[PDB]
Write a protein that binds this ligand. Structure first.
Ligand code: SF4
Ligand code: SF4
Ligand SMILES: [Cl-]
Ligand SMILES: [Cl-]
Lengths: 448, 444
């Protein structure tokens, strides 16, 4: 298996890769299967069934909203986030769905959109079935999809091009860099060029950077109360006014320093995510705050930041991502926010001039400081503790960087060891369950 | 029952369990020889180190500590600079100046044993002091266990009066504060007056702070390479000169102060537990940042800091059996961070709820953290964990305050998860080269 920077960082929408983006793509792919199989013209009814962990937290994650819009051919990277709620409301009030954006058809939630919290499909807990029927109520087709993380999906029947410098461990990564006289980012570039041209790769990285920067500004401006039931006030816009626009009275805890700026940038992004705005996974929507907050700090700190520093930051980040990833890859929040902090740490460190060993050392400290972190967020939403974790995660990633540079790389433990610990604490998590009000499921599976 | 002064005790580094404890055991063994009036007849003392105490005692200077402690040096007061030379003289001259009074022969090959492969039955950090007469007859032997924080217990006492507002949970501490109309600091002062007077509590807190402040200063000056064999260079001095990636900001100062302290600890300097020697850098680092970023802190603020910190520490410690309390580094570095966030939060004017929320977040960002340091020394990853720990405490404080307390999970639930990850660590073993014992038992 080959993993790309563009697998780790993808443009979609919030609040959840597993529960928002994946089901929206599964819906898009259901439309395509109707075409493939020549059943679209006969189809006069669609039915959606959500199982297990999709059904239990789907409402708070906008799974229904994502799927309904996706059935009209809205894609998560391009849909207008502001349209999702009004459009969903229109479909349900009017009992009509514009299937594939080509054909209106009747749609009744009582029979057509079911939440089966107490049933499971057997490959994975994030399961759904789509069904289409003719005007005579005959079943034309059914298809089960699993949302397996990051917004990737598979069919039930699919559930179970080599680059020049492939690597599976931290140790093999250093060994290859040494032997070919490359940085971590340079080695990555060579690998990414197996699948794309240098100009695709470079353009893809700046697009990601631009969307992150817009999401930060959107977060800084959108006052509001988050949905889903915690009445969680968005904090980033007031904090923006205090620290950037010199309005209102700074509290004793609201000083304008490096840390509260990391806080501002991360919370802005994760607040957008929770609200359903455009988001770049990094590597998931839940962990999305950390990488841009850090990149943005890096920008405000050295305004001679070049395009090549930006490439290096992303490719270095990607490399570390790969170490951790390369479907029972579910290891709790450490495999998301943890991996985001480690990636960001490694990127900043490479850009600030660390050796190969210091880049790993930095990643290692950042991860160390998340080992064991589970996913049991309050009511199922990507809000508490998720939002405070990205802030906390941005700050840890900068400090891990500082430890690795100030420490001259001395304060280090093998990154391969820290990855082994991630994987074992992750397995142990299969036996720790949420409250049976949250459905009594294991805490190794990310909600985001 | 637990006192602010139980968690913050003046001593010497690198380790509460391996250096301060065994020193107080020797001190106690001398007092047992006075008490049973066997000191006159004593011509030989013999020390045997067992288990996890032997495994890493050399790196933790347990030998140095025990030999100075057999001369009635005490961890609170010894000149730390006198520990190494004085041990060399004892071993080079084959002569132990017992209790400072009487000079006896001392032969390390028979009288100082490291028994790495054997265990005493109660606990892994156990020792035995024996005294013998001129004819090689046992006068008396006494097993001690060093069970954390520098506390000791004899073998017979191992398996074994109350304040007005006792609390065992985060929840109780809130109920009592609302009911009786008191901040956490004020309820703590009330509880602490059970054993001391106000002016002792107050003077004792101020003494702790002074030693912490001197400890930071010392670390900011003492250039060097740390002992034990990782050739770990001290970074606090350069950093201090540079702040007078090297940005001179809130973060690099927290780093500076925490590393100053933990480097002093690793080098064997004077150190105040908080709650352990290995976790020593966090609380002072946060206190100094607090002092530097607002008005000259009043003495009351300082009282509020330490007493608010201590209540959080008690939530973690209370009602725990000696083995239950062993929950890896989260139980030491984690607890310091949580304690420091809580104290900073109360000084800065947070509600009871926000003080609890900040403690909660700080501990959350340490859950499952094990004790498995490199070669067994209190260096790696111990030093970066205190820098990191000070940073998370301040930031946990911000989260609680900027979030107006909304970003909260119950502290009781985080405290419980601490315990079960702790329990699970009993089956996670260090490498065979470090002795194969579990990673839940703090080395520091
Ligand atoms: S908690 Fe679960 S959901 Fe919230 S961020 Fe960590 S992983 Fe994503
Ligand atoms: S690692 Fe073990 S020794 Fe180093 S601090 Fe944490 S607990 Fe104390
Ligand atoms: Cl059901
Ligand atoms: Cl994708």
């Amino acid at each position: 298996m080959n993993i790309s920077v563009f697998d780790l960082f993808s443009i979609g929408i919030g609040p959840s890769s597993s529960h928002t983006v994946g089901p929206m793509l599964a819906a898009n792919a259901f439309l395509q299967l109707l075409e493939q199989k020549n059943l679209f013209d006969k189809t006069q009814r669609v039915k959606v069934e959500l199982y297990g962990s999709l059904a239990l937290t789907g409402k708070g994650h906008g799974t229904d909203k994502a799927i309904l819009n996706g059935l009209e051919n809205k894609a998560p990277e391009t849909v207008d986030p502001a349209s999702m709620i009004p459009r969903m409301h229109e479909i349900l009030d009017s009992n009509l769905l514009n299937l594939a954006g080509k054909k209106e058809i009747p749609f009744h939630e009582a029979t057509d959109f079911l939440f089966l919290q107490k049933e499971l499909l057997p490959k994975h807990s994030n399961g759904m079935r789509f069904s289409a029927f003719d005007g005579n109520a005959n079943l034309l087709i059914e298809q089960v999809y699993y949302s397996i993380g990051g917004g990737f999906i598979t069919t039930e029947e699919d559930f179970d091009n080599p680059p020049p410098y492939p690597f599976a461990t931290a140790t093999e990564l250093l060994k290859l860099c040494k032997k070919h006289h490359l940085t971590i980012a340079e080695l990555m570039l060579v690998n990414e060029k197996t699948w794309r041209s240098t100009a695709e790769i470079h353009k893809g990285i700046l697009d990601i950077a631009k969307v992150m920067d817009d999401c930060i500004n959107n977060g800084c401006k959108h006052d509001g109360v988050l949905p889903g039931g915690l009445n969680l006030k968005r904090r980033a816009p007031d904090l923006y006014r205090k620290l950037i626009e010199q309005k209102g009275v700074k509290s004793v805890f609201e000083q304008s320093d490096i840390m509260n700026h990391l806080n501002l940038y991360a919370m802005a992004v994760n607040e957008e995510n929770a609200a359903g705005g455009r988001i770049v996974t990094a590597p998931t929507n839940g962990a999305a705050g950390i990488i841009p907050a850090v990149l943005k700090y890096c920008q405000q700190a050295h305004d001679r930041m070049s395009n090549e520093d930006i490439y290096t930051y992303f490719l270095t980040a990607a490399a570390i991502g790969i170490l951790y990833k390369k479907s029972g890859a579910e290891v709790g929040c450490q495999g998301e926010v943890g991996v985001a902090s480690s990636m960001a740490a490694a990127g900043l460190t490479a850009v600030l001039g660390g050796t190969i060993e210091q880049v790993e050392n930095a990643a290692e400290i950042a991860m160390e400081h998340h080992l064991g972190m589970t996913c049991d967020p309050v009511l199922g939403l990507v809000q508490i503790p998720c939002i405070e974790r990205n802030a906390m995660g941005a700050v840890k990633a900068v400090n891990a960087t500082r430890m690795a540079l100030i420490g001259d790389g001395q304060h280090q433990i093998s990154l391969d060891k820290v990855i082994k610990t991630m994987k074992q604490t992750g397995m142990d998590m299969q036996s720790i369950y949420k409250e049976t009000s949250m459905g009594g499921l294991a805490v190794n599976l990310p909600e985001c």
